Amino acid sequence: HKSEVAHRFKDLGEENFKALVLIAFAQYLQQCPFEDHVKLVNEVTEFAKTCVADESAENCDKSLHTLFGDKLCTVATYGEMADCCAKQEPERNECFLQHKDDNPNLPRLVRPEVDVMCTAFHDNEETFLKKYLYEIARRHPYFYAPELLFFAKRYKAAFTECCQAADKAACLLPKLDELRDEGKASSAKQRLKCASLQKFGERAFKAWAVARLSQRFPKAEFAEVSKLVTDLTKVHTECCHGDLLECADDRADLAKYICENQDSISSKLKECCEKPLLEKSHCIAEVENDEMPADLPSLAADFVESKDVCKNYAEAKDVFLGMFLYEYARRHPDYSVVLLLRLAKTYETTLEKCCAAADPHECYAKVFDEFKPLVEEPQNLIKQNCELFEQLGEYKFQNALLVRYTKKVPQVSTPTLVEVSRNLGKVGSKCCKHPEAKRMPCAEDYLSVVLNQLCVLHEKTPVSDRVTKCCTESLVNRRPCFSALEVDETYVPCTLSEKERQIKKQTALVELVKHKPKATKEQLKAVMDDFAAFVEKCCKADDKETCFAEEGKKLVAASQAAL
Numbered sequence: 058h059k060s061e062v063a064h065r066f067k068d069l070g071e072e073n074f075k076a077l078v079l080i081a082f083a084q085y086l087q088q089c090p091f092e093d094h095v096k097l098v099n100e101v102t103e104f105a106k107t108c109v110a111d112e113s114a115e116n117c118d119k120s121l122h123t124l125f126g127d128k129l130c131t132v133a134t135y136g137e138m139a140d141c142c143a144k145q146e147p148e149r150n151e152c153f154l155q156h157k158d159d160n161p162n163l164p165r166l167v168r169p170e171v172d173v174m175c176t177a178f179h180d181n182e183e184t185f186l187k188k189y190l191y192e193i194a195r196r197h198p199y200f201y202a203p204e205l206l207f208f209a210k211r212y213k214a215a216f217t218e219c220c221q222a223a224d225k226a227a228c229l230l231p232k233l234d235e236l237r238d239e240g241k242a243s244s245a246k247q248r249l250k251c252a253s254l255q256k257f258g259e260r261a262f263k264a265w266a267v268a269r270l271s272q273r274f275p276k277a278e279f280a281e282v283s284k285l286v287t288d289l290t291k292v293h294t295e296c297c298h299g300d301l302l303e304c305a306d307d308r309a310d311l312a313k314y315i316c317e318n319q320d321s322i323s324s325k326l327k328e329c330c331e332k333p334l335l336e337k338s339h340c341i342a343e344v345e346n347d348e349m350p351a352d353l354p355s356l357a358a359d360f361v362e363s364k365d366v367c368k369n370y371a372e373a374k375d376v377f378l379g380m381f382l383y384e385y386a387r388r389h390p391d392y393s394v395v396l397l398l399r400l401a402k403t404y405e406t407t408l409e410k411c412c413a414a415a416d417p418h419e420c421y422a423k424v425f426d427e428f429k430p431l432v433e434e435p436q437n438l439i440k441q442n443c444e445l446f447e448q449l450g451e452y453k454f455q456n457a458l459l460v461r462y463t464k465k466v467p468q469v470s471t472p473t474l475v476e477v478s479r480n481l482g483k484v485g486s487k488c489c490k491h492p493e494a495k496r497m498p499c500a501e502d503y504l505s506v507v508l509n510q511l512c513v514l515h516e517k518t519p520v521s522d523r524v525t526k527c528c529t530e531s532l533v534n535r536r537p538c539f540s541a542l543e544v545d546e547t548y549v550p551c552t553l554s555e556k557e558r559q560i561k562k563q564t565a566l567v568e569l570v571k572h573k574p575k576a577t578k579e580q581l582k583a584v585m586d587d588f589a590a591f592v593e594k595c596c597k598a599d600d601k602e603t604c605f606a607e608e609g610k611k612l613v614a615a616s617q618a619a620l
């Protein structure tokens with residue numbers, strides 16, 4: 058047991074050890090140069106082999122925070138992450154974490170042309186892929202390191218199969234702009250999992266987990282789900298605390314376990330558990346929810362009618378609420394996790410109040426009646442925005458929400474709002490196409506992450522106490538806290554693209570609603586319609602920028618005159 062580097066090296070392999078170590082160095086020291094990290098990665102990788110050969114060799118006994126911190130401390134003074142070294146453990150590693158730059162300073166990543174890129178690769182495949190992990194982990198310091206190993210293998214395959222194609226650009230770019238989209242979503246989706254542990258606790262995270270895993274594996278018993286939750290919570294605690302080697306291994310041992318215990322988990326993991334290691338864990342995560350068992354008793358007899366309701370609750374409070382979550386969640390694949398958790402806390406309060414009572418049954422009898430307005434509230438919201446999407450179209454719909462929510466929160470920065478609206482646009486596409494039954498959990502997967510992305514950015518750049526209240530108040534009732542955000546008060550002041558030529562128009566309107574929030578949907582559409590007539594006329598004159606300058610600062614006091 059003596060060595061922890063060795064236990065990892067043996068388990069993960071030479072190739073993965075090197076990689077996860079590079080991800081971890083880039084995640085802690087984001088501003089530090091590429092060539093310097095590789096130097097250190099190799100230094101510890103060579104050292105780890107030393108310990109595999111002899112576990113009782115010098116400094117092999119040391120923990121990975123003591124080891125990776127020291128190596129990282131070799132130049133780092135860095136700047137605020139300079140004093141992180143003085144701290145001298147467990148303060149040293151704890152420092153590195155709180156100091157992770159979510160909103161980086163780092164220069165914008167500019168895509169060099171196909172032939173240019175295919176010759177940095179091929180020639181030096183090695184440092185090429187090692188640059189990919191370096192640049193991603195830097196700009197995404199909560200990016201699921203084991204997931205990023207799978208992304209590097211998808212990036213290598215898009216290059217070790219496209220640079221050798223008749224049409225190189227048509228091969229590379231549709232897969233390289235897919236891989237780019239898929240990783241931005243994975244960083245956001247994991248940054249929320251982390252926030253759920255850091256800003257809400259182990260119990261909230263574990264509750265989300267019990268709900269979700271119960272929805273996915275309804276055939277599986279309660280003791281089984283509880284095993285997976287316990288293991289899953291371990292992987293993410295480590296992965297979120299920067300123990301990238303430990304969790305990567307624990308995610309591997311869990312993928313393995315699921316595959317050897319399918320009978321007691323699901324039927325839908327057949328091909329998943331035949332796939333290679335990195336694909337395996339990813340497969341199981343994106344797997345389709347299994348069928349809920351045929352027959353099954355009504356929750357009421359076990360959580361309302363039973364005399365032992367307050368007995369089993371006072372005895373084991375968390376187990377009984379876990380069983381409520383498990384039993385409700387598995388019967389409800391149609392409900393979102395967040396929703397199922399509201400019903401669990403709602404129930405928790407009815408028990409906390411009623412089991413103190415002289416007649417608990419006559420007190421908590423009508424509890425499933427508190428649940429109806431809770432379920433109905435989002436059910437109605439989806440088949441509303443879906444009707445509005447089918448009506449207005451992706452662009453117009455986004456503009457409806459952009460205006461609405463800029464009026465509600467002009468404090469939240471313009472690009473956070475434009476990006477928020479553009480994620481909800483995807484709810485209109487991707488989620489409304491689905492039938493009723495699949496739509497609601499589909500909806501939270503873009504909302505949860507976009508409200509949390511907005512929340513996370515609000516730490517580096519705080520502007521409102523009102524927003525900060527929702528970003529903390531509660532995990533689950535975050536969505537209604539933003540929906541019931543009435544507003545604030547009286548403290549308010551040519552071509553080249555098409556998809557982005559829309560954002561240019563969006564960011565403008567967002568700012569326009571920032572300035573004049575009293576403007577009516579009549580006024581705002583009248584200005585944006587006369588905006589369309591500005592670009593249309595000027596992109597067809599034979600004195601191009603002469604029209605943009607003179608006829609542009611012509612509607613400036615025709616919009617400001619429409620006040």
Ligand SMILES: O=C(O)CCCCCCCCCCCNc1ccc([N+](=O)[O-])c2nonc12
Binds near residue numbers: 343
């Ligand atoms: O799923 C993985 O992360 C990779 C593990 C390997 C695959 C195992 C099977 C799938 C388990 C799915 C459950 C994921 N747990 C989660 C907990 C808490 C929050 N939260 O926001 O509070 C989540 N948001 O999205 N997911 C969350």
Ligand SMILES: O=C(O)CCCCCCCCCCCNc1ccc([N+](=O)[O-])c2nonc12
Binds near residue numbers: 395439497536
């Ligand atoms: O699990 C749950 O019940 C919770 C999610 C249920 C799924 C609901 C899907 C309906 C369509 C919603 C689309 C419009 N809504 C919103 C836009 C913008 C912001 N913003 O703050 O910028 C919002 N905050 O709240 N709602 C927001």
